[PDB]
Structure formats: structure tokens, C-alpha cells
Amino acid sequence: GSMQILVTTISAETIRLEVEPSDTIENVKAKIQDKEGIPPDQQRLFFEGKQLEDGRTLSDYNINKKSTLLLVVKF
Amino acid sequence: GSMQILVTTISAETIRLEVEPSDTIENVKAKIQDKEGIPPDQQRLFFEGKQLEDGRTLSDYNINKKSTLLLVVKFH
């Protein structure tokens, strides 16, 4: 149109979570809901590029102390 | 204690804005409030690394058609 401009809107935060190696990623998503207020269904967890899927644990993906996890959310 | 992991929470979206080259940054910030719902003083605008100031126009920073602007917004 007249002059169409693009605005790259960014929002970012780093949340620390006290978890057990026995904790399922379902339980990890539940801990994020208490900390921020995002439902587990719309949450997308990542580690080493691989999308963390429910039914498995943090030990299965070999996640230990001081591990960087990636959470991608809407708007 | 037992195991303390870090979760890098990211949220991103691109907003399309019909603006005039005569428009000031305070007017562009007002247009973002209508599109998303963020107050103009709590939003930081950028172009070519330089932080865009409320007083100056889009012509002053040489912003034209198909220009990518950066808006950094608070967590929640």
C-alpha cells in the first residue's frame, strides 16, 4: 500500500526449574504453567534440536543439571 | 539442589503497519497499541541497530517500503 512496514515483535525470558531426572516432560510442562501460566498443549519443548514429546522422561533425552531447554509460545 | 534446569522461553510475531513517511515514531508506537495492545512508552523500537526516538519521523532514519523494524517487548 502507501508504505507497508514489518515489525518484528520479540518477547523473551529465562525460567529456572527444579526438576527430578525421573520427571516426565508432562510434569515439566505442568511446572511451566505454575511459573508463567501457559497450558501444556500449546507449549513446545526442545533440547538438542529434538522436540520433547510426552510419555518419556528427562533421563531419556539425557537432561541433567544446568541444561538449556527451549520453549516456543504464541504472540 | 537436586537438578536445576534453564528454560529459554521465546515468543515472536511480525506486525504489518501501513504508515506515511511523514509519521513520527510516537504515531507508529500508537499504531502498535491498536494492533497488539501494548502502551507506547513501554515499547522499544529499533532500525539498523539505532533505537528509534518518539520525536523523529520515519524519513529521518530513512525507512521506506519493505523495511524491517524491531520491537522488543517485556515478558508479561
Author numbering:
A (entry chain A): -1 to 73
B (entry chain B): -1 to 74
Question: What text comes from the article?
Answer:
A multi-step purification of UbV.XR resulted in the isolation of two distinct fractions by gel filtration chromatography. The earlier and later fractions eluted at volumes consistent with a dimer (UbV.XRD) and a monomer (UbV.XRM), respectively. UbV.XRD forms a symmetrical domain-swapped dimer in which β1 is flipped 180° away from the β sheet of its own subunit and is replaced by β1′ from the other subunit. Whereas residues 6–9 in wild-type Ub form the loop between β1 and β2, in the UbV dimer they extend β1 and participate in hydrogen bonding with β2′ and β1′ to form a continuous anti-parallel β sheet across the two subunits. We postulated that reverting Ala10 to Gly as found in Ub might fulfill our criteria because only the main chain of Ala10 is involved in interactions with XR, whereas the side chain is buried in a pocket on the second UbV subunit. Gel filtration chromatography revealed that UbV.XR A10G was exclusively a monomer during purification and remained a monomer after incubation at 4°C for 1 week (data not shown). The UbV.XR A10G variant showed no evidence of binding to XR in SPR assays and did not stimulate XR-mediated UbcH5B S22R∼Ub discharge. Taken together, these findings suggest that UbV.XR dimerization is critical for XR binding and stimulation. The β strand domain swap in the UbV.XR dimer appears to be a unique arrangement for a Ub-based dimer. Once UbV.XR dimer has formed, no shift to monomer is observed, but the two dimeric subunits have some degree of flexibility relative to one another.
We report the development of three ubiquitin variants (UbVs), each binding selectively to the RING or U-box domain of a distinct E3 ligase: monomeric UBE4B, phosphorylated active CBL, or dimeric XIAP. With ∼600 members, the RING/U-box E3s form the largest family. This family uses a RING or U-box domain to recruit E2 enzymes thioesterified with Ub (E2∼Ub) and facilitates transfer of Ub directly to substrate. RING/U-box domains promote Ub transfer by shifting the equilibrium of E2∼Ub into a closed conformation (Dou et al., 2012b, Plechanovová et al., 2012, Pruneda et al., 2012). We generated selective UbVs for each RING/U-box domain and used biochemical assays and structural studies to identify two types of UbVs: competitive inhibitors of E2∼Ub binding sites on UBE4B or phosphorylated CBL and an activator of XIAP.
